Amino acid sequence: YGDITQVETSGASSKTSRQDKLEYDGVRASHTMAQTDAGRMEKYKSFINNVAKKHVVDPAVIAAIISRESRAGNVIFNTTPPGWGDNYNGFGLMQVDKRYHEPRGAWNSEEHIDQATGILVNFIQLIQKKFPSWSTEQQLKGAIAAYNTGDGRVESYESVDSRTTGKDYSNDVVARAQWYKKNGF
Ligand SMILES: CC(=O)N[C@@H]1[C@@H](O)[C@H](O[C@@H]2O[C@H](CO)[C@@H](O[C@@H]3O[C@H](CO)[C@@H](O)[C@H](O)[C@H]3NC(C)=O)[C@H](O)[C@H]2NC(C)=O)[C@@H](CO)O[C@H]1O
Ligand SMILES: CC(=O)N[C@@H]1[C@@H](O)[C@H](O[C@@H]2O[C@H](CO)[C@@H](O)[C@H](O)[C@H]2NC(C)=O)[C@@H](CO)O[C@H]1O
Numbered sequence: 001y002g003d004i005t006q007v008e009t010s011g012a013s014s015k016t017s018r019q020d021k022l023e024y025d026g027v028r029a030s031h032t033m034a035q036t037d038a039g040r041m042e043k044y045k046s047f048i049n050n051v052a053k054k055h056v057v058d059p060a061v062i063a064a065i066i067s068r069e070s071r072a073g074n075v076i077f078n079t080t081p082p083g084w085g086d087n088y089n090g091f092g093l094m095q096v097d098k099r100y101h102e103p104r105g106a107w108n109s110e111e112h113i114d115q116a117t118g119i120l121v122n123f124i125q126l127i128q129k130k131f132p133s134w135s136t137e138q139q140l141k142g143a144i145a146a147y148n149t150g151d152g153r154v155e156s157y158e159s160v161d162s163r164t165t166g167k168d169y170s171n172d173v174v175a176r177a178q179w180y181k182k183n184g185f
Pocket of ligand 1: 015020067068069071075084086090095148166
């Protein structure tokens with residue numbers, strides 16, 4: 001769907017990087033945050049594999065979104081009820097936003113991952129129609145950015161993250177995905 005290994009990235013902003021108490025930012029910070037979540041990520045392997053097969057999306061991209069969205073459950077396992085974020089709008093491992101989609105499945109379920117990964121695919125389709133001459137890698141990064149901010153707030157490739165949380169969402173998610181691709185979980 002575009003090739004994640006060829007997407008350019010500047011990784012995590014300093015703000016994002018700070019929250020893991022890191023003294024550095026950027027791609028190395030993304031790698032470290034991805035590595036932090038890799039153990040928790042193992043629990044969801046059957047599900048991530050199944051869904052990646054169904055949507056034809058790299059499991060590293062799914063895993064990167066799980067890491068960025070909820071730290072593979074670390075910051076949502078204990079809300080009430082469990083599985084909630086973004087007050088109280090984001091549901092599950094991948095933080096499906098209830099305002100736009102009815103959240104399906106248990107917070108940590110295959111059904112949930114399926115939904116959220118389908119949402120990403122819909123954004124890949126939307127960004128390919130919006131910028132059909134961007135490269136497929138630019139398109140995939142825009143789709144990831146849209147997963148956070150809407151395809152309506154992805155205006156250019158250089159400013160792809162300018163309207164995202166932390167101004168770094170697709171930059172970070174891409175770097176984490178690159179880590180998971182290279183290292184596995
Ligand atoms: C290892 C660990 O648990 N570290 C915790 C930090 O991850 C956590 O920082 C906050 O992390 C959450 C999850 O990444 C961030 O919230 C998410 O933000 C994305 C957009 O980027 C949004 O789409 C998700 O819905 C949302 N999920 C939830 C559950 O709200 C949040 O923005 C981070 N906060 C900041 C200031 O960066 C910190 C607490 O901040 O605790 C660490 O232990
Ligand atoms: C994972 C998730 O739920 N992502 C959210 C986006 O869906 C959402 O963008 C909105 O997506 C809908 C497509 O299903 C569109 O109807 C709507 O046009 C679109 N919003 C914009 C501004 O383009 C965004 C909105 O910021 O939030 C995400 O959390």
